[PDB]
């Protein structure tokens, strides 16, 4: 298999406007949303059809209850942070947890928190400790590290449970997650040469330009990998043409173990 990852985010807002939820939690497998929950629906719901078809109502009912408790804890945590920062107005609190199953079989695992969109606390599951970015985070670090059992529980969940969930979801959605749609790639002039690819899945792709056989990293403009809306992605890379001297320019595309070269005449 290619590399795959599972991750869950949480978002809390301390003073949201009229309709916006106080709390949102979404899970992903790779780039695909799989689960959602917020403080308005108060229900955990599938975001991918292959999650709905493979997890019985007992699953969604249980995690709905857990998420209602997690929602309340997030509110209490954010209130504490904003009190200790001495901040007025509306502020955000965020969490991300997850794991990666790499092609070679090795694994990674991660857990971190953010306040107002900036790193706040980052878990190290090897040293079993929390990295604090400031003294509000330092106070939380001390309280969390005093509960050593919870640190060990988080290490076990990242290393064993998360990976087991991921393999389970990967089999559920294997028709989506494990398929390959190779890119359609073309070159055009607009003076710079634009190498454009579209129609491809998975979104991971490497496009670069060579000049007479050498890569020119500082000279290349890399476009974002963007969704086209039909399950496939598109991307591009540009390079500026020398009007004083001819050169041998070629676009190089790497995708899912296949390399492609478009030499520009």
């Amino acid at each position, epitope marked *: 298999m290619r590399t795959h990852s599972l991750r869950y985010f949480r978002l809390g807002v301390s003073d949201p406007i009229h309709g916006v939820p106080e709390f949102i939690s979404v899970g992903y497998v790779d780039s695909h949303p799989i689960t959602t929950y917020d403080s308005v629906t108060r229900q955990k719901e599938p975001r991918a059809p292959w999650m709905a078809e493979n997890l019985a109502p007992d699953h969604w009912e249980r995690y709905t209850q857990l998420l209602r*408790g997690w929602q309340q804890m997030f509110k209490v945590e954010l209130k504490r942070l904003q009190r200790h920062y001495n901040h007025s107005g509306s502020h955000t609190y965020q969490r991300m947890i997850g794991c990666e199953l790499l092609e070679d079989g090795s694994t990674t695992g991660f857990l971190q928190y953010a306040y107002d969109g900036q790193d706040f606390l980052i878990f190290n599951k090897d040293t079993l400790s929390w990295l604090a970015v400031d003294n509000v985070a330092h106070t939380i670090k001390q309280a969390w590290e005093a509960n050593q059992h919870e640190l060990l529980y988080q290490k076990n969940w990242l290393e064993e449970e998360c990976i087991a969930w991921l393999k389970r979801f990967l089999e559920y959605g294997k028709d989506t997650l494990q398929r390959t749609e190779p890119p359609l790639v073309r070159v055009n002039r607009k003076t710079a040469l634009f190498c454009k690819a579209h129609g491809f899945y998975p979104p991971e792709i490497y496009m670069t330009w060579m000049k007479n056989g050498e890569e020119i990293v500082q000279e290349i403009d890399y476009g974002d990998i963007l969704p086209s809306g039909d399950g496939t992605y598109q991307a591009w890379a540009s390079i500026e043409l020398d009007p004083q001297s001819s050169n041998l320019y070629s676009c190089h595309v790497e995708h899912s173990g296949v390399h492609m070269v478009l030499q520009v005449p």
Partner: antibody
Amino acid sequence: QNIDQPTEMTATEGAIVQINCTYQTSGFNGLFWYQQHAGEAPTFLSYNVLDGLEEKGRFSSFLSRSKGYSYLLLKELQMKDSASYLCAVKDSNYQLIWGAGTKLIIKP
Amino acid sequence: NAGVTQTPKFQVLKTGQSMTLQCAQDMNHNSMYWYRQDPGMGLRLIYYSASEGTTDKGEVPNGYNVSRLNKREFSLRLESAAPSQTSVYFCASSVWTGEGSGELFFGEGSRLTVLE
């Protein structure tokens, strides 16, 4: 999903006893031991989630995730250790699954 | 600092009679639980309350109902008692739920005997 522990064990005062708990569960988020004196409430004894042995006074609790096995070790048994010992495991959905308990009888 | 306080300690009931068991905690816990303990088997969850304002069935909810009245109180209701509900009932609480290492704190237990 099953949690198994012996119904009853009998040991002599001053000796050592090892109470086994094996579990088969859908996922694993930790194993708990609780002490329950007859007619009283269970109270929390230990929590294990990584492999190895943790010590707390005369009691130690061991965990092997790969073997799906824990034991509660009581050293230097006293009469006040006569009680039931409950093991319990949190599964992948954070459901606590309780073993039926081991009644420990101590011979003075 | 009473911990978990449940009542009554003992109760005889006739089949068909209604009963409410009370439970309060003064530990500012968010999660509360109602278990029954019977010979030869582990504790079985009847109903639980992950947080104030939500409750849900456990493993053996039939014949029972609950009310998370506030953050402190979690009452258990036997609307029409049956002999099968002869048991010792335990209320418990934890700081949160969905947290692997947090332990349960138990009340003293309530012994119900339901008779024809």
